[PDB]
Amino acid sequence: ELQLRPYQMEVAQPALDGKNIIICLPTGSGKTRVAVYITKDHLDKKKQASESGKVIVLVNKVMLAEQLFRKEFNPYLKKWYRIIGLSGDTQLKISFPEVVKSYDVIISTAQILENSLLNLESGDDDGVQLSDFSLIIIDECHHTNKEAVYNNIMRRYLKQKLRNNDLKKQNKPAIPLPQILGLTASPGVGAAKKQSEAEKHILNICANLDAFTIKTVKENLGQLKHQIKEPCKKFVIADDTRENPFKEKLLEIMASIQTYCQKSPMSDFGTQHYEQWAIQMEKKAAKDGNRKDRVCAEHLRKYNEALQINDTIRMIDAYSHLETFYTDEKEKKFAVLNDSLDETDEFLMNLFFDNKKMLKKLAENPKYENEKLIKLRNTILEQFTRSEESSRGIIFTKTRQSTYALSQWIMENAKFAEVGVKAHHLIGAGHSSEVKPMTQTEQKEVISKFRTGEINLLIATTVAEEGLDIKECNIVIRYGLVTNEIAMVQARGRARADESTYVLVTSSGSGVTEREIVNDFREKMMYKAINRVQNMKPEEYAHKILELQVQSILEKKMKVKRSIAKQYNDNPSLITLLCKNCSMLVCSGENIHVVEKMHHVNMTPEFKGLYIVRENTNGEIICKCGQAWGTMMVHKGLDLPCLKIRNFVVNFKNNSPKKQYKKWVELPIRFPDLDYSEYCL
Amino acid sequence: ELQLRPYQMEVAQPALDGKNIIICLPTGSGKTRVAVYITKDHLDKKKQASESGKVIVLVNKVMLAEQLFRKEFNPYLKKWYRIIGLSGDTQLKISFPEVVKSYDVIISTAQILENSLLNLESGDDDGVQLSDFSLIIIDECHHTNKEAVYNNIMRRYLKQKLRNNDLKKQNKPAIPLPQILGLTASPGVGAAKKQSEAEKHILNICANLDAFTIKTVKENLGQLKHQIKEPCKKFVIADDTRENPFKEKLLEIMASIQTYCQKSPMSDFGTQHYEQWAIQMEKKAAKDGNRKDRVCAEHLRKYNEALQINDTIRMIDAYSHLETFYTDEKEKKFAVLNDSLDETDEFLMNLFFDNKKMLKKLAENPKYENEKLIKLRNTILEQFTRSEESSRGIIFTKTRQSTYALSQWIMENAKFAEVGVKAHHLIGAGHSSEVKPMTQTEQKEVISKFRTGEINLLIATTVAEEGLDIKECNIVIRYGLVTNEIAMVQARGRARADESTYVLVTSSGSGVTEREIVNDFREKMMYKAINRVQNMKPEEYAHKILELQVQSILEKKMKVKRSIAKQYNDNPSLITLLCKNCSMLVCSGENIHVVEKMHHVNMTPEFKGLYIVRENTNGEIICKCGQAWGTMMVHKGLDLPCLKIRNFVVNFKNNSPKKQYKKWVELPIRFPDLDYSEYCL
RNA sequence: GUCAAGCCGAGGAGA
RNA sequence: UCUCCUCGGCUUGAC
RNA sequence: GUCAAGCCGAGGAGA
RNA sequence: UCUCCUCGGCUUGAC
Numbered sequence A, B: 001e002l003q004l005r006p007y008q009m010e011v012a013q014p015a016l017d018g019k020n021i022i023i024c025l026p027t028g029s030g031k032t033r034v035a036v037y038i039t040k041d042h043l044d045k046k047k048q049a050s051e052s053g054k055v056i057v058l059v060n061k062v063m064l065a066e067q068l069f070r071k072e073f074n075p076y077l078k079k080w081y082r083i084i085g086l087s088g089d090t091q092l093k094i095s096f097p098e099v100v101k102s103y104d105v106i107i108s109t110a111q112i113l114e115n116s117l118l119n120l121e122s123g124d125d126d127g128v129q130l131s132d133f134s135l136i137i138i139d140e141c142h143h144t145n146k147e148a149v150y151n152n153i154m155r156r157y158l159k160q161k162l163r164n165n166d167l168k169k170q171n172k173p174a175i176p177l178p179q180i181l182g183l184t185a186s187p188g189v190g191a192a193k194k195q196s197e198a199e200k201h202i203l204n205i206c207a208n209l210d211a212f213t214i215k216t217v218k219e220n221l222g223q224l225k226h227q228i229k230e231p232c233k234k235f236v237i238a239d240d241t242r243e244n245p246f247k248e249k250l251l252e253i254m255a256s257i258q259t260y261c262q263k264s265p266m267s268d269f270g271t272q273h274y275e276q277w278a279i280q281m282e283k284k285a286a287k288d289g290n291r292k293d294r295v296c297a298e299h300l301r302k303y304n305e306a307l308q309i310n311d312t313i314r315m316i317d318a319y320s321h322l323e324t325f326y327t328d329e330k331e332k333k334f335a336v337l338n339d340s341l342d343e344t345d346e347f348l349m350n351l352f353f354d355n356k357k358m359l360k361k362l363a364e365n366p367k368y369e370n371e372k373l374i375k376l377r378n379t380i381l382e383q384f385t386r387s388e389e390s391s392r393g394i395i396f397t398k399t400r401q402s403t404y405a406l407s408q409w410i411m412e413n414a415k416f417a418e419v420g421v422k423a424h425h426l427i428g429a430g431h432s433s434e435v436k437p438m439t440q441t442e443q444k445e446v447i448s449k450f451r452t453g454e455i456n457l458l459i460a461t462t463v464a465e466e467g468l469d470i471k472e473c474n475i476v477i478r479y480g481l482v483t484n485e486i487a488m489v490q491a492r493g494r495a496r497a498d499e500s501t502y503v504l505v506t507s508s509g510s511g512v513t514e515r516e517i518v519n520d521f522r523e524k525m526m527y528k529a530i531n532r533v534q535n536m537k538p539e540e541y542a543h544k545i546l547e548l549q550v551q552s553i554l555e556k557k558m559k560v561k562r563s564i565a566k567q568y569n570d571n572p573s574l575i576t577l578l579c580k581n582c583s584m585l586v587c588s589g590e591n592i593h594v595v596e597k598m599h600h601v602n603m604t605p606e607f608k609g610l611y612i613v614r615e616n617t618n619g620e621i622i623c624k625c626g627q628a629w630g631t632m633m634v635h636k637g638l639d640l641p642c643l644k645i646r647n648f649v650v651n652f653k654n655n656s657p658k659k660q661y662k663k664w665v666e667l668p669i670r671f672p673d674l675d676y677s678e679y680c681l
Numbered sequence C, E: 001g002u003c004a005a006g007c008c009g010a011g012g013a014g015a
Numbered sequence D, F: 001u002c003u004c005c006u007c008g009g010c011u012u013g014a015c
């Protein structure tokens, strides 16, 4: 029951007989149908050719793997061949290599394959080789870039092709190379401004993929333009003239703390540049060991983040964030009191709590809650009232807190209730930003609920920009967020409806429409570059792509050269670790060991009788000054407390250039594994 | 008249002089002969050494205990020494300790010994100590795992060995430790994917057994390969395209009930995931006290189980199951009527009975009974016709109902009758799944009847996978069931014949052959891991096994730490128990008592004048809503009615977090024993 | 020698 | 955490 | 089938 | 170099 379209056949025709190539078409153009048809044709050809037929599909998105397996690929080809989808969430209980020789067709994430190849090279496991295959298919080929995963695999492929090229003029025997097929929508521009540089970027993409030609539809293009509809663009801007009674108070607090610190930021409040200056300032303070500035630097960072979220989101979330971390610090102080006075800390607490109550009073004010938020509400109301149950609303924001607060508040707002709108916030799996993480299964359940229509409003982040193919969508909006041309075009290419609306909500002061025009111009420039390369001479095309392949290969070689070791110091115990907030000695480099080369830890009783544990098994570990050190873990049955090096400060025994690494692997010196013969009886 | 073989001597040679070790050989390799020869040699050595000779054999299977005593061990060694086999079925009338010092040789199940040791530690009974022995022999050593019974005993042994290790460098006197011998076929892989992890698993097995070396036959291996024959593999697949007239009606009923409940399973019908979602749903309903959903959740679970058995077995069994539990519920309703109306219950009854009659009409249809079943019939017919009375047929299925229905239906089918096949269903002792339990003596009688050839077809479950040594077997099949590599290899290693057939019957949609390939790969990987460990350095081997012994010891110590009490609440009467299906109060925590610390019960007349009794001495107890509460028992001469806590719902007097424990011991609070001075005159 | 009921822990498979 | 299966141990009772 | 924790690398945006 | 976001992989654990 497989189907195709005239433009699909036109674009895919060269690939039907060799011609490892790329395909670039607008979103919702049946690209996956083209891919499944091409795979079916190639496998039938191989069977008729009495040769092994092995095809892989590679995705950077697990959700895309599952969606492609469920919807478009397996149903058509379930009967003819064997099919399977792999992922981290999927338990690869069988193996990767066996499925390479069991299912005859693979759907996977790139570095499943890459890890198998690395294991093969290291010899730990049998692994796999590209020669084992006959056809590789990649989605979102634009992600093939300087050294991304797709590009890593293709660098191995290109080295093999160069070896073959050496062989052809030297020896007849050669290593077979599987065909390569790429699929994308926007090949992208690496910020190239001159259209010439955009052409060079496109040539780089082709060379990385060994692409013989872009092969975009021209003759049938017309009908495709008629088949695919483009959403109506809509720009919405609001000026932040309100927030004075609350934001001005926050700026007053920040200025008072600056006076207490006697430091000149030389930057506007609430700007991320202020936060960068802070970062530098507390790094300097900790390296110098000085206090009254690093702690205040951290607090100023927190106030800057609060100011930003207030600028985007209402005041109450910023107030809650402030009082939450202040309460955590207060509980740390209480624990420190329990085991056994401060001036800076007491100063901050006293200046804070009163203003915190005042800001609690101010926060609940619907008269001047915000401007952009009011415009967002008016918009959502208008479209959801005009749809008459035909609305699938998508909102894009920047951070976790925005999504969660907006969902909670839309559910609190009575207007969205009487319209009947149901809003659910969506985020990635990784926990961060003090927001409850959403599990992969939770992600899938929410997407399914939106698909069934139970959720008429989905708030999400760049997670939602890519993938998430939905049959019908009418409303897409971007809340004061802007990344680049790609992100914007895929966000806009989602309202798959006869009537579609694109909306942007931006602050008047911020230059977001500048980005939007720049993105428009890059989109226009890319098409001309594609036309130019499509009209190039095949010989010159081949020479340039070969030159760029050499570029990539040599770049990897010399990056490895600069990263063979690049820091070779075998010093087991030549350092002392002190606390960061306060300059108390913690330990030396001898009392520490490693487990599974995975966790660094110290088990000596000297460590044990120094820290404190905060309650809610995996209780966390804090210092005596109130600095957070680490967390309890339970491995081996041992209650070993680990720690984050970022929380501590280094001190060399030779000349002590106090410095912060933020991370273990960054440092040169190795630490031994924990032989646990000790702690016995 | 004892005999041996060259490879047997080769493998057993190290154990003949100390060297507590493991042995791993293919099934039917005379392992029991090797064990009896080794025991004879060790006992002769001890007699020549003028030292006490005590040998134990441990089995996880009572049938294996009896078989080893009857067939291979006692006949050879009846004259030279004293021999006895122990078990639960065997009445250990003498004692365990006396036989430890009476028969000089023991065959037992592991926690006979473990219970004796626990009694010794507690001081209730004299018990036994490992020092009393000189040699322990274990069969199926793979069962020694994270904290299994063999592993429990070996953890005690390893702690004793660590004490000895402390003594050697401190004090000359030491506690003697008996030699350790293990026997198995597949040491197994704990789902380890990297062959390195499989090697770690094997090292874990060795460390748990204090194994000095695997000691697998290499030089004589060749002849063994020639002596042992491997069955011819055969794969059979059928696609479930039929069942529409009946299964579609069942799905219609399920959808109608879902509409009545207004709930979205978001899962396919007939899938165990649906049943898990149900479980969660009625747990939530009962905790919330809401009806119209918990009862319907239970019914949906029953329909899901019916769908599964229909997918495997024909329709009539599912129909019978449905009408049986509906009839039981109807009789409950009639009793409830007798002592003194419902909407949900009436809805379900009315929707059911008519469709039940219709499904009775549909069930008796041989045209589209099933696919996998037809293939099974065709197979069995082919092999039993081609054997010409030389067929010993073994079938493996998943559940009780499958076994019983298949046996009854094979006897009903005229084809198996004209072939003369005799089919008997086999299950475990424990009653469950609404199938008559098969007594241990019934098990033994059936096995004997199969051995004599009176039963040419034995239908069984994982019970039959292990043990059951038969001289001649030609046909082994697996009906749409798949567990792991071990189960599969022991199922395949049973057709002990020159010509042997292995067959698998699987649904096309289900991924069972995926498991089969995975199991093949694990079997291949295990052998390479065994080779690698056999080639290891003895010192590094010793160090790693010592590390793993420490791992096990500390794991047990800290599991005990987390399980010292882990829930310490001495609250006699601080709870109220209500009914589960309906929210009627049953009793409080004061009116209940305990007998033999064994049965919780309430005897107050307030309890008595609330429940109803269903007829067929041990009549069962139901609620007034139709909920089952418990059962009559006769202890002390008292007609005390007990109950299952799983059937009731908890309600705390403090803050009432309604929750389900499913089981008494799980809860913290203790209940007093029943001092029966009351109820006197 | 046969049966019933109940309780304790363990393992494997699935999800 | 749920389901299915498997195990063996312990108590009580009856024939 | 569910959850937690930790680690490895990659990309994009900003500055 | 910093921040924000995004990704996927690996280990351990628990239910």
Ligand SMILES: Nc1ncnc2c1ncn2[C@@H]1O[C@H](COP(=O)(O)OP(=O)(O)O)[C@@H](O)[C@H]1O
Pocket: A003, A004, A005, A026, A027, A028, A029, A030, A031, A032, A033, A034, A469, A471
């Ligand atoms: N031959 C065809 N005729 C009509 N529609 C098609 C055909 N093939 C695919 N489609 C449509 O294309 C959609 C798939 O879009 P897809 O190509 O996955 O988006 P993207 O290009 O972003 O991957 C399906 O919903 C289907 O309706």
Ligand SMILES: Nc1ncnc2c1ncn2[C@@H]1O[C@H](COP(=O)(O)OP(=O)(O)O)[C@@H](O)[C@H]1O
Pocket: B003, B004, B005, B026, B027, B028, B029, B030, B031, B032, B033, B034, B469, B471
């Ligand atoms: N020395 C021997 N020579 C020939 N056959 C033997 C010898 N010892 C044992 N056997 C055979 O081995 C069988 C016992 O198999 P067994 O080892 O119990 O299976 P498993 O290895 O699964 O326990 C007996 O039927 C017997 O015929």
Ligand code: ALF
Pocket: A025, A026, A027, A028, A031, A139, A140, A184, A185, A467
């Ligand atoms: F392949 Al697309 F949006 F073009 F997922």
Ligand code: ALF
Pocket: B025, B026, B027, B028, B031, B139, B140, B184, B185, B467
């Ligand atoms: F000891 Al076996 F099958 F190998 F019972």
Ligand SMILES: [Zn+2]
Pocket: A579, A580, A581, A582, A583, A584, A623, A624, A625, A626, A627
């Ligand atoms: Zn400190």
Ligand SMILES: [Zn+2]
Pocket: B579, B580, B581, B582, B583, B584, B623, B624, B625, B626, B627
């Ligand atoms: Zn009731």
